[model samples]
Target: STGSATTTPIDSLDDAYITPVQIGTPAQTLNLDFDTGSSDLWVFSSETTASEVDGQTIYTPSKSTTAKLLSGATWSISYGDGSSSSGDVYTDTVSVGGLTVTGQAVESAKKVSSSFTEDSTIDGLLGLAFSTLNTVSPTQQKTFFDNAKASLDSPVFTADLGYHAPGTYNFGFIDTTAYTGSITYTAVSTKQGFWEWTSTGYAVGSGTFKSTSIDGIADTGTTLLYLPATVVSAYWAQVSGAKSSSSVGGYVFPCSATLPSFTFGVGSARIVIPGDYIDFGPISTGSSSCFGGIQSSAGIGINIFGDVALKAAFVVFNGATTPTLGFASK
Candidate 1:
């Protein structure tokens, strides 16, 4: 049987949306993200200048009645795309989706840059992945999950990706109801925050692509599907009148044609990329233009299957009991 947690809707308060719940008698709230790549929870703070903090939820220390700041330790993080942020350590009561935990380690960003700060809608990221990519070290010490795990009913946390809306990421207790049967769990390697694996091969237009075997990683931080040059080219070739477009930096095809279904093999598991996902413009842009959901990242060793891919499955990061991940169809 699939275990379930009550859903919590975020409220718009303090010029931002927040969900409140009791964490061991202390009330705390936090922002959420659908990050499948990294494991860490960070928040914006009063120290951030008004100009630097736009469209993000900033937690004012003065307003938080139960929050505590960590002294001496500081933090800074940089992404591969040249975006970065820095902050100091803090602790507080944190709760989400009706589940509560006390002494949750939270980051107070004094400075933030990169696509994350510019993204407007996301206030802060609560990484639900794993600790392999934890930025905190012994000298600095403590990640949100590392400290909060002791208070949780189970060290394990599950992400209900398809909840509410397309991009609405939810957390808390694992909802076993979403699972069809037994959960297929895989052991995770201790490395970066990303779950890296080797692709058995890729299918394009019902056929295997040449030189398809490749190493890739599943990341929630990213937004779209990225693939190798050869794989992208092979897949695009199947679409009629398909050609490269400079506007989107990916392949574009006529919208009327029936795009063939494509799938990528990871071990024995096959992840199918739907045809509608390939046509990104019709749903959001209201245009017939073929916005390429799949792009070529030839030299990029990390093949990121972002939210576009994650939405199709139920994912669990089992850090408390064992270093592993569990995935199943919804």
Candidate 2:
């Protein structure tokens, strides 16, 4: 899953936000998001009214000679967080980093909520999160990895999360500059969109405890780290004078002291989430002692280790070699 070479370079979208890049002559910059949870490239267009858009960045397709709209094909997407957007399908020559991908499928959302339309800084999501969750049909869907697989120098894409930037996710040809040593890969499960894996056990502070057989999924699209009630209770027990209070939808705890670091054993791999993440910032009730990244979703189908968990290590996606996912030091 590691090597080096050079060809038409293509960059993967790392964060939920899409960055604008220039294509061929008659200079035009297209915006794209790197979403792993889904597979598709969508952008806003001139046909879209300002009212239908909120925080999302808009792209001017007219500026690109290669841009084309697909007749009669429209798209509408709804997320678990209750946000939604609707748009039409289009095609254009898309480029990321220095790589230019020809005849790439793109979507143009005409109606988006304030959360999406208001973000003028981001153009659209690239959807590098996963291929199965793509909104576009299989015949039309295209992912950054899918397009660059045959040409990438290393045939691998890795994500590096910056500690200072909570929402910042960077992607490109795997750069090993910050790595302390070689890469460690984990076998990927054959499950659907969610990257699920078996858990060996749980730990709070430095103490390890036994629990019911629980599996977890690593989701980049999600922002919080969710755990089961049994696991949460055990984790809270380790914090001195840690008590829970009522909040919007999840449990909030008060603990000013430095909490212990927690780790999850996935088979032989031990995944650790630092204690700083447990220190939740001030909430609406002005309680700064609350947990910052812990949330409860009892009705939800699965336990998800989101960005808060991913920040601990570098993640690599190897679609070229049996769709494997590997983690290593940044």
Candidate 3:
């Protein structure tokens, strides 16, 4: 059987896509957030302190006949968005969709932050990053994707995100019908444990393409696009009423302010992110003041081409040798 799975996006959450995964024997199913940004298949479980976990469903490893705790093994991880989790390790049979991997490393949580507990349906993280980023102590664990890659016809996956619309995450195969035009592939550097790459150039509004090089990560777990301050400032300059609002944090604008689209060079593809997508949302719900989707990544040195930037284009995250990234119009 070829390795492949399709995940459906959650309603109202235009963030990462989720898929139901069965962990352990007798099978306990939980909705997991498939994150390509980090490596660690951690889940809220019976091991998690009750007070620390809010509405999340827990995986009772004890109930599974096949569950085995790796003695002396422990793992802890903090996400870029401040969410954190840690716990003992268990080797069990984990299945995603119809793909199953025996002896898969499933980190059981002892505790987590409000960020993780706040999501009711989110069971844990199903990391698709390299096995090198696994946080298990003493022995690093291979991710579910890595564990199942050899069985795949091609070690590849594609993320097709929509604008508040239902989308799909296809694995082991690229659905050619999902994208238009050609798939422009770019070489990637995964040394940082991310699908890291550089954009050839970028432009603001209708400004001529400035040959600016920006090294960044294509992160699905993140919600906004973060770029260098200089690049962000240039984009804000194009909007008449847009200004860097320290009070509101980052760039803000009046509700009616029209914004020009921005474009970036990826391989030979000129990926244009629409202006409407860049207008994240109001400072507060129903407020007239709005924040820009593109913000300064000064504090976080690494630039992130997050969900906002990715939704506009269909993406192919090639885990093949050299880890190339492919882009095509939606």
Better of 2 and 3 by TM-score: 3
lDDT (10s digit) by residue, model 2, range 2-87? 22211111212222333455543455665554556656577766767778665544566777787776777777788667776777
**Candidate with best TM-score:** 3
Q: Candidate 3: where is the Cα deviation over 4 Å?
A: 1-13
TM-score of candidate 3 relative to the true fold: 0.93
**Residue-wise C-alpha lDDT for candidate 3, range 164-249, written one tens digit per residue:** 77577776888889989999998888788888889888988888998878899888778788999999989988888889888876
Model 3 Cα shift for residue 160 (angstroms): 1.3
Encode model 1's per-residue lDDT on 1-330: one tens digit a residue.
112333222321111122222322333344455345665566666787666877765676666666776667676766655777778766676666544555666667788885666756655666555555656544444444555566566666665444224322234356667666555666565566566655667787667644356665666566566788877888888888888777656677777867776676645666566666465554235667656667777645667666555555666666655466666666
The C-alpha local distance difference test score for the whole of candidate 3 amounts to 0.84
Query: lDDT at 167 for candidate 2?
Result: 29
> All models: lDDT?
0.59, 0.61, 0.84
Better of 1 and 3 by TM-score: 3
lDDT of 2 at 330: 48
lDDT of 1: 0.59
Question: How far off is model 3, as Cα RMSD?
Answer: 1.9
